[PDB]
Amino acid sequence: QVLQRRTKNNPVLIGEPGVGKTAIVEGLAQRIINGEVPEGLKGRRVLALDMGALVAGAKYRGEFEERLKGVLNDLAKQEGNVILFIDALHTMVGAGKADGAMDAGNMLKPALARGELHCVGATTLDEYRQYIEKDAALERRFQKVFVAEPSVEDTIAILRGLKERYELHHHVQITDPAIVAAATLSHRYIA
Amino acid sequence: QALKKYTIDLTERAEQGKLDPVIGRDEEIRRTIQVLQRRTKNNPVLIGEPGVGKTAIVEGLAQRIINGEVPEGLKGRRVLALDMGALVAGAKYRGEFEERLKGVLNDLAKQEGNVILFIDALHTMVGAGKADGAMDAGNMLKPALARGELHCVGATTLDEYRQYIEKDAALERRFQKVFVAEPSVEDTIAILRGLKERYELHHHVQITDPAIVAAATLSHRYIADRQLPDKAIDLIDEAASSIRMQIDSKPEELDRLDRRIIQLKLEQQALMLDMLNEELSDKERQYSELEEEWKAEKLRNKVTDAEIAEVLARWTGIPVSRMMESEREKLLRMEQELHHRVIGQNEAVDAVSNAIRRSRAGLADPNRPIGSFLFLGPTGVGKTELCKALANFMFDSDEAMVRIDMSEFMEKHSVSRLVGAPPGYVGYEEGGYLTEAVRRRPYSVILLDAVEKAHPDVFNILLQVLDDGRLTDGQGRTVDFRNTVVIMTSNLGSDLIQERFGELDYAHMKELVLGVVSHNFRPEFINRIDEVVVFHPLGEQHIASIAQIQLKRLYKRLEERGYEIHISDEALKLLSENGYDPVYGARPLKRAIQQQIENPLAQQILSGELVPGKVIRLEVNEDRIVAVQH
Amino acid sequence: GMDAGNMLKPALARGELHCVGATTLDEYRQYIEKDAALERRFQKVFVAEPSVEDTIAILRGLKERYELHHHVQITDPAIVAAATLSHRYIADRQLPDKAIDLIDEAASSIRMQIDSKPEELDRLDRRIIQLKLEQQALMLDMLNEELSDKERQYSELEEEWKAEKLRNKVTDAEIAEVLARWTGIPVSRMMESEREKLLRMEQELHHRVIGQNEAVDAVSNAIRRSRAGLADPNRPIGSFLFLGPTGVGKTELCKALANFMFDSDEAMVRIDMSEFMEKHSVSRLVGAPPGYVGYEEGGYLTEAVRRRPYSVILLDAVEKAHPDVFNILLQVLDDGRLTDGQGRTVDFRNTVVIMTSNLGSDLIQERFGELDYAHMKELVLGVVSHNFRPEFINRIDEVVVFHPLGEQHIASIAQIQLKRLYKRLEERGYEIHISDEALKLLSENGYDPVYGARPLKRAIQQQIENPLAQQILSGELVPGKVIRLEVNEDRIVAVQH
Ligand SMILES: Nc1ncnc2c1ncn2[C@@H]1O[C@H](COP(=O)(O)OP(=O)(O)OP(O)(O)=S)[C@@H](O)[C@H]1O
Ligand SMILES: Nc1ncnc2c1ncn2[C@@H]1O[C@H](COP(=O)(O)OP(=O)(O)OP(O)(O)=S)[C@@H](O)[C@H]1O
Ligand SMILES: Nc1ncnc2c1ncn2[C@@H]1O[C@H](COP(=O)(O)OP(=O)(O)OP(O)(O)=S)[C@@H](O)[C@H]1O
Ligand SMILES: Nc1ncnc2c1ncn2[C@@H]1O[C@H](COP(=O)(O)OP(=O)(O)OP(O)(O)=S)[C@@H](O)[C@H]1O
Ligand SMILES: [Mg+2]
Ligand SMILES: [Mg+2]
Ligand SMILES: [Mg+2]
Ligand SMILES: [Mg+2]
Numbered sequence A: 001q002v003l004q005r006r007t008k009n010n011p012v013l014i015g016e017p018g019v020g021k022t023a024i025v026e027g028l029a030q031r032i033i034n035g036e037v038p039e040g041l042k043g044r045r046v047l048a049l050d051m052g053a054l055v056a057g058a059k060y061r062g063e064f065e066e067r068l069k070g071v072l073n074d075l076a077k078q079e080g081n082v083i084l085f086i087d088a089l090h091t092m093v094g095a096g097k098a099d100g101a102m103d104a105g106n107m108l109k110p111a112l113a114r115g116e117l118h119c120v121g122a123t124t125l126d127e128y129r130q131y132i133e134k135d136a137a138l139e140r141r142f143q144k145v146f147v148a149e150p151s152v153e154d155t156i157a158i159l160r161g162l163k164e165r166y167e168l169h170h171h172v173q174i175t176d177p178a179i180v181a182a183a184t185l186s187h188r189y190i191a
Numbered sequence B: 001q002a003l004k005k006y007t008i009d010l011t012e013r014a015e016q017g018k019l020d021p022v023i024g025r026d027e028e029i030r031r032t033i034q035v036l037q038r039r040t041k042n043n044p045v046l047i048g049e050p051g052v053g054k055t056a057i058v059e060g061l062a063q064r065i066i067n068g069e070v071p072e073g074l075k076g077r078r079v080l081a082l083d084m085g086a087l088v089a090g091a092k093y094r095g096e097f098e099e100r101l102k103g104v105l106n107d108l109a110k111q112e113g114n115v116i117l118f119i120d121a122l123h124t125m126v127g128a129g130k131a132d133g134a135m136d137a138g139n140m141l142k143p144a145l146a147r148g149e150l151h152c153v154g155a156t157t158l159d160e161y162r163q164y165i166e167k168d169a170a171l172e173r174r175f176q177k178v179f180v181a182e183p184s185v186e187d188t189i190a191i192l193r194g195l196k197e198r199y200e201l202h203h204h205v206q207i208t209d210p211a212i213v214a215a216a217t218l219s220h221r222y223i224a225d226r227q228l229p230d231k232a233i234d235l236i237d238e239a240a241s242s243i244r245m246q247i248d249s250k251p252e253e254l255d256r257l258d259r260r261i262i263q264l265k266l267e268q269q270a271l272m273l274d275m276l277n278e279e280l281s282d283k284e285r286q287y288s289e290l291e292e293e294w295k296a297e298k299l300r301n302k303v304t305d306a307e308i309a310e311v312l313a314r315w316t317g318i319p320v321s322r323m324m325e326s327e328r329e330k331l332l333r334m335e336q337e338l339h340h341r342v343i344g345q346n347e348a349v350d351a352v353s354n355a356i357r358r359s360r361a362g363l364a365d366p367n368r369p370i371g372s373f374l375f376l377g378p379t380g381v382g383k384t385e386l387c388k389a390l391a392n393f394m395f396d397s398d399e400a401m402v403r404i405d406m407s408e409f410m411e412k413h414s415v416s417r418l419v420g421a422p423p424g425y426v427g428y429e430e431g432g433y434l435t436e437a438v439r440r441r442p443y444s445v446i447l448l449d450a451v452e453k454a455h456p457d458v459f460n461i462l463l464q465v466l467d468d469g470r471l472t473d474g475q476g477r478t479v480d481f482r483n484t485v486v487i488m489t490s491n492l493g494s495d496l497i498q499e500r501f502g503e504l505d506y507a508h509m510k511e512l513v514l515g516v517v518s519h520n521f522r523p524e525f526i527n528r529i530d531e532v533v534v535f536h537p538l539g540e541q542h543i544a545s546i547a548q549i550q551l552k553r554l555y556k557r558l559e560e561r562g563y564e565i566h567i568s569d570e571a572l573k574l575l576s577e578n579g580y581d582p583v584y585g586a587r588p589l590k591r592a593i594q595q596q597i598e599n600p601l602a603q604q605i606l607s608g609e610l611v612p613g614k615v616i617r618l619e620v621n622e623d624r625i626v627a628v629q630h
Numbered sequence C: 001g002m003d004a005g006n007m008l009k010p011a012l013a014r015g016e017l018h019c020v021g022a023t024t025l026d027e028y029r030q031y032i033e034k035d036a037a038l039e040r041r042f043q044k045v046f047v048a049e050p051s052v053e054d055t056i057a058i059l060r061g062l063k064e065r066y067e068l069h070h071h072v073q074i075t076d077p078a079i080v081a082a083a084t085l086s087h088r089y090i091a092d093r094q095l096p097d098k099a100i101d102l103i104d105e106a107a108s109s110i111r112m113q114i115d116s117k118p119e120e121l122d123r124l125d126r127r128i129i130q131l132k133l134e135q136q137a138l139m140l141d142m143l144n145e146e147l148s149d150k151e152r153q154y155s156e157l158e159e160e161w162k163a164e165k166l167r168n169k170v171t172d173a174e175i176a177e178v179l180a181r182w183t184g185i186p187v188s189r190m191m192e193s194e195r196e197k198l199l200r201m202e203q204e205l206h207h208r209v210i211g212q213n214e215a216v217d218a219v220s221n222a223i224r225r226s227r228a229g230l231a232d233p234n235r236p237i238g239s240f241l242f243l244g245p246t247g248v249g250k251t252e253l254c255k256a257l258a259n260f261m262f263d264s265d266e267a268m269v270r271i272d273m274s275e276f277m278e279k280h281s282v283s284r285l286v287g288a289p290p291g292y293v294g295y296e297e298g299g300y301l302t303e304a305v306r307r308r309p310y311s312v313i314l315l316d317a318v319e320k321a322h323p324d325v326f327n328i329l330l331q332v333l334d335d336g337r338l339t340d341g342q343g344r345t346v347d348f349r350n351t352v353v354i355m356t357s358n359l360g361s362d363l364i365q366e367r368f369g370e371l372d373y374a375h376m377k378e379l380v381l382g383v384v385s386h387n388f389r390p391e392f393i394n395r396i397d398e399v400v401v402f403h404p405l406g407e408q409h410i411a412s413i414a415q416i417q418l419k420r421l422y423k424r425l426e427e428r429g430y431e432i433h434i435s436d437e438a439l440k441l442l443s444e445n446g447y448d449p450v451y452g453a454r455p456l457k458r459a460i461q462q463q464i465e466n467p468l469a470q471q472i473l474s475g476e477l478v479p480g481k482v483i484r485l486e487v488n489e490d491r492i493v494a495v496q497h
Helices: A022-034 A051-055 A064-077 A089-093 A104-113 A127-132 A136-140 A152-161 A163-170 A176-189 B010-015 B026-036 B054-067 B084-089 B096-109 B142-146 B160-164 B185-203 B209-222 B230-248 B252-270 B277-296 B305-315 B325-332 B334-338 B346-361 B383-395 B414-419 B433-440 B461-468 B494-500 B506-520 B540-559 B571-578 B587-605 C008-012 C027-031 C036-040 C052-070 C076-089 C097-115 C119-137 C144-163 C172-182 C192-198 C201-205 C213-227 C250-262 C281-286 C301-307 C324-335 C361-367 C373-387 C407-428 C436-444 C454-473
Strands: A011-015 A045-048 A082-087 A120-124 A143-146 B007-009 B044-047 B078-082 B115-120 B153-155 B176-179 B371-376 B402-405 B445-449 B470-472 B478-480 B485-489 B531-534 B564-567 B615-620 B625-629 C238-243 C269-272 C311-316 C337-339 C345-347 C351-356 C398-401 C431-434 C482-487 C492-494
Touching: A011 A127, A022 A045, A022 A082, A022 A120, A051 A064, A064 A104, A064 B084, A082 A089, A089 A104, A089 A120, A089 A127, A104 A136, A120 A127, A152 A163, A152 A176, A152 B252, B007 B010, B010 B054, B010 B078, B026 B044, B026 B054, B026 B176, B026 C097, B026 C119, B044 B054, B054 B078, B054 B115, B054 B153, B084 B096, B185 B209, B185 B230, B185 C119, B209 B230, B209 B305, B230 B305, B252 B277, B325 B334, B325 B346, B325 C454, B334 B346, B334 B383, B346 B371, B346 B383, B346 B485, B346 B531, B346 C454, B371 B383, B371 B506, B383 B445, B383 B485, B402 B433, B414 B433, B414 B461, B433 B470, B433 B478, B461 B470, B461 B485, B470 C269, B494 B506, B506 B531, B540 B564, B540 B571, B540 B587, B571 B587, B571 B615, B571 B625, B587 B625, C052 C076, C052 C097, C076 C097, C076 C172, C097 C172, C119 C144, C192 C201, C192 C213, C201 C213, C201 C250, C213 C238, C213 C250, C213 C351, C213 C398, C238 C250, C238 C373, C250 C311, C250 C351, C269 C301, C281 C301, C281 C324, C301 C311, C301 C337, C301 C345, C324 C337, C324 C351, C361 C373, C373 C398, C407 C431, C407 C436, C407 C454, C431 C436, C436 C454, C436 C482, C436 C492, C454 C492
Parallel strands: A011 A120, A011 A143, A045 A082, A082 A120, B044 B153, B044 B176, B078 B115, B115 B153, B371 B485, B371 B531, B402 B445, B445 B485, B564 B615, C238 C351, C238 C398, C269 C311, C311 C351, C431 C482
Antiparallel strands: B007 B078, B470 B478, B615 B625, C337 C345, C482 C492
C-alpha cells in the first residue's frame, strides 16, 4: 500500500533485530514472482542497492555523485518499474559524506519526496533513532512499517515452513515436537 | 551551454502542468517577491520545519510567474532550480568544479537579470566541492550574492540551517530568512481540497470531503513526529492506495482469510494433536460466506473518513478505527472478560472498563491521558493482576506494557533514569526509559507499581504527565502521553481497609483512605488522578475462585508436559480452607497450592511412579492431598 | 592548491606586493592565525560596527541610491526609524547592513503596491479566489456567508481604491512593517481589527478563564504596555509569578494567552519545571559547554526563543525545581539576555515569562475571606520570600494571587466543559441538550474548595461520559436525535426523544 502512492513511495521496515525485516522484502519479491500481488505490481523488479559498491572506488571529487546520479537516471529510465531496496537505510544516511561531498541522503532526498523512487528501506528501531531521526527531512521522506516480533504460534508456523530447507542442508529430519520445543523454549529462556 | 546542463527550468514544468497546485501561502509568496526585487541581497531563504511547504512556495512562485499572477517586474522571469549534485557530480579534476560554477554564473549574468536561481537544500552549498582547491561553492557565489546580481531563492530547513549555514556567518548575511510556518488545521483542509483532484486522478478513486477534513483533524491530533500538510496528504494518499488495491484484486477480509487458509494449508502439510483442521474448516466456511456476500454486493470504492481512520490506526498504532462488530461485542463484555483473571474487585474493573469505553466511544478528553488511576488496598488482592489483565485484554499479551517498578526509585536521581540525562552527561544519547518507550508505541498501558516505595518528589514528572499528557526528555523532544493509561498501584491504606471494610459502604471508605493518601501525597498530584479505586480484602468465596484459576493454569502447565489431572471436590475445599487468611490476600493460597500439590506431585513425577496418560486424581487423606494412579 | 600562501609569503614581507585583504573576524582566527608567518605578513586593520548615527549618515547617501533604483521616495524619518528599529529588534545581524535591508525591502514593498494594487486588495483577492475554489470543491458549507462577506469587503475596498484614483513614499510605518515580517514582533502600527481585538483583551480571556480578575488585568496591562510603545526596552515584556491553590486557572491563563496572541495553545515555550529537580537540568535548558556531548544541539530555551523572539515562556510549577535554575532566570528576567553553551546571547526582551506555582495554597485557602487583595498578596509574598531569594523576586514584574473557585465560578466552568463535550459529540455526529437540574447536579457534585475545578471535570467525566459511552457503544443511541440529559432521583440519564 505504501509503494503504490503518488508521492513518498518509501516504506521503511522498522523493528528489533531478528524479527524478519529483510525477510519481508524477500517475501515481497517472491510474491511478485509468483503473481500473488495486485495487478499494479505484477512484473516489478526488486533491486537491492549496494552502498558499499557505490562508495567503494570513488576517491576523486565527484565520483560517488556520478555513480549515484547514473543509478538515479537508470531508474528513471525504467519508467517506474523498479522497486528499489536499501537495507540498513542508515548506511544510506551517511554514505558518500566526504569533505564537502554530496552524500547519498542529500542526493536521494529530492527523488524520494517526489515519489519517483520506490525505495523500500529496512532499519533497526535503534539505528533509526541514532542515524535517521538525526536528519528530519530524510526522516520524513519514509513511511514507517513497524515489524513486531512474532508470537510463539507464528514462530511455529515459520519453523514448519523453513524446516524442509534445514533438512535439505543438514541431511537430517526435524520433527514437529522439536519445532514447538524450539519456539517455546527459546521464547521462555533466551533473553 | 552551462545553464541547460546544471539547472531544471521550473517555469517550464509549471507551463507543462507538471507541478502540483499550490494553495494559500499568500504572505510567504508575497514576501519572497519583495525580497527578490531588491537591489542588493536579492536572496530569500525559506526556513521552516520539514514538511511545512517550502518547496511548494517556490513551485507556487513559478506557477504565478507562468499565469501572470505576479507584479510587472516578474512577468517573464525564469525559475531555474540549481542542482548542486550534478555540478559536483562530474567534476573529477582540479579546477573542473570552479570552472562549471563560474560558467553558470556567467550565463546567469548574460540573462540581463531575467532568471530566479533556486537552490533547495541550500545547506548543501556551504562546502560543495571543497578540496585542496577549497573554493567551496559558497565562497564563489558570495560576491554575486553580496551585490544582488543573483536572485537565488534558497529553501533550507530550520535545524539544517543552524548546523550548516550559521557556522559560516559570512554567507548567513547574504540571505533573508523568510519563515514558513506550519499551516493550521483549517488551512490544511483548504489545501487538501485543491490537491484532491490530482490524487484522485492518480489513484482512480474519489476522495470524499469528510475524508479531507478528517485527515487534517486526525493527523493533527494523533501524529506528533510530522507536520501539516504532509501527514494529512500521507493519510489521504495511502488510503487511496488501499482502496485502489481493494478494487484491483479483492477486499480486506477476503485477503485475510485467503492468506490464512493458504497458511494453514501449508501448516497442515507440515503436520504430515492437530486442532488445526478445525481452524482451517472454520476459516474456509467463513471465507465461503464472505465470498457469497461479495458476490451479492457485485463494497469500498470511495475514500471516506473510515479509510483515513484505518490508515491512521495502522500508521500510529492507536485504535481510531470504527469498531467492527466482533471487537465491539468483545468490548461490551470488557468487565466479563476481566473477571476471568481478576475475581472480585468490582469497582476497579468497572473503572478500567469505563475508561476504555470512553476512549473507544470518542468521548475522552483529548488534552489528558486516557485513564489515570490509583489502585489502593491490601497485599495480594489483584492490583497488579488488574494491570496485567488490562495489558492482556488490550494487547493479547500479559507483559506487553510499559512497566515501571517504583521501588527502584527511592532516591531523587531516578527522575533522570526515566527522562534521561541532560546535555553534557553520560546517558545523554541513550534517552530515557519512559519517554523512549511511550514514544515507540504511543497507545500503551503504563504501570507504576508500588507507588509508595518511591521518593515523594518523583511524582512531579507525573504532574506534567497526568495533567497534559506531555513529558520532555533530556534531548528536548516532548513525548505525547495522550493515548496511554497510567496506573499507580499502592497500599497506602491497607491497615485501615483491613480494619474497617466491615460496616462501611464504598464511599466512606474512599473518603477515609483518600484522607490517608492526602497525608502521603500532595494536593497537586491527587488532583490529576482520574479515579482512585480502593480494593477490598478477599473472602472465602474469592479464594475458592482464585484456587480454581490457579489450578487451571497448573493443569495447563502439566498437560503440555503430558499429564492429565483431575481433582476431588473435597481437595479443592482443603486448598480453599488452608490458603485463607485476611491479611495476605491470595498469595497464601498460591504457596499452599505449591506445597500441598506440587511438592508431592513433583516428588512422584521424578520418581517414575506416575506414568503419563493415566488420569492423575488428587484425592484427600485425613489431612493430606495424595495423588493416585488408576 | 607551496600552493597559494607560501608563494606569496616571501613576496609580502618585502613590501613588493600591496595586498589589501579583507576577511572576517572569525575567518582570520580559523584560517590565518593558524599559520603564524602568514599571520605576521599582514597588518590588522579593525573595522568596527558603526553606531546608530553613523548608520543614519550611511543611509542618507544610500537613500539617494536606492530611490534612484526602486523609483520610490524614502522619507528621512524612515531612515532614522530603520536605524533605530534594526538596532533594537534584529539581533542576528549588524549595522549598517540590516538597516539597508529594511530600507530596500520597504522600497520593494512600496514599488509592488504602486505596481499591481495595494496590500488589502491583494489579501482579499487571494482569499476570495481561494474560497471560490474551495466552494467549487464543496460541490454544511458555512462558507457562503464568509465568501459573501469577503466579496462585499473587496468590492468596498475596490470602490475606495477607485475613489483615491495610497502609498508611494517610504515612511517609518513601512519600515516597521518590514521589521514585523522579518522578525515576528508586532512593531507595526495598530490597524482597526487588531486594536479592537486588543481593547477586548480582558473580555476575550474570560471566555476561557472565568473568575481570576487580577491576573487577567495584569496580563492585559502588560501587553497593552507593549503595543503602545511604553515597555521598558531593556527587560522582557512581562515577567509574572502565578500563585494560588490547584485548579484555579494558572496554566489556563497561560494557555489563554498563547491562544489569544498566537491562535494556538501549543504555541508557547512550555518548560515543565518539575523536570529540573537537579543541578544539571540547567544544562538541559542552556546547553552543553564546548567539548561535551550535547554541544551541537544547542539549548532548549535559547533555541526556542532565538527562532521566534516574540513568544510566551511558560515555567510550570516552578517551586518543584532546584534553585540554580532560578539563577539562570535571574539573568533572563533582569536584562533579557541568556548566553547558551555555544556562546551566543539570545535576546529575551520581546517575551512574556510566566511562572506558575502554588506556594501559598493553604494560606490562600484559609484566609481569602476576611482579607482584601493587598494583605493577601503581602502574606503570600512573605511565603514566596521564604522559598525564593531576594534577588529573584525582585526581578518579578508582578506577583498575582489566584483565588479559589466558588459556586458561580464552577457553574460557569461547567458550562465551558459541557460546550467542549458538545463539540466532541457533534464532531462524532450526536447532539445533546442538558437539563438545568442536571447542570445543578454537576455543579453540586463537583464543588469542593481544596481542589479547585478538576473535581468538576471528573464529575462530568463520570456522571455523563461513562454511561454515555456505555450507551453509544451499545447501539442504544442513534445518530440524528437529540440526547436529553435528564435526571433520575440522583443520576443523570440519557434518553432518545
Ligand atoms: N516470516 C519469516 N518467514 C520465514 N523466515 C523468516 C521470517 N522472518 C524471519 N525469517 C528468518 O529469520 C532469519 C533472520 O531474519 P532477518 O530478516 O534476516 O533478520 P533481520 O530482520 O534482517 O534483522 P537484522 O537487522 O538484519 S539483524 C533468517 O533466517 C530469515 O529467513
Ligand atoms: N501550501 C501548499 N499548497 C499545496 N500543496 C502544498 C502546500 N504545502 C505543501 N504542499 C504539498 O505537501 C507536500 C509537502 O512537501 P514539500 O513542501 O515539498 O516539503 P518541503 O516543504 O520541501 O520541506 P522539506 O524540508 O524540503 S522535506 C508536497 O506534496 C507539496 O506538494
Ligand atoms: N483478585 C484476584 N483475582 C485473581 N487472582 C488474584 C487476585 N488477587 C491476587 N491474585 C493472585 O495472587 C497473585 C499476587 O497478587 P498481586 O495482585 O500480584 O498482589 P498485589 O495486588 O500486587 O498486591 P501487592 O501490594 O503488589 S504485593 C497474583 O499473581 C494472582 O495469581
Ligand atoms: N478559571 C478557570 N476557567 C476555566 N477552566 C478552569 C479554570 N480554572 C481551572 N480550570 C480547569 O482546570 C484545569 C486545570 O487548571 P490549572 O490552572 O491547569 O491547574 P493549576 O492552576 O496548574 O494548579 P495545579 O498546580 O496544577 S494543582 C484546566 O484544564 C481547566 O479545564
Ligand atoms: Mg537483515
Ligand atoms: Mg523541499
Ligand atoms: Mg503488585
Ligand atoms: Mg499547572
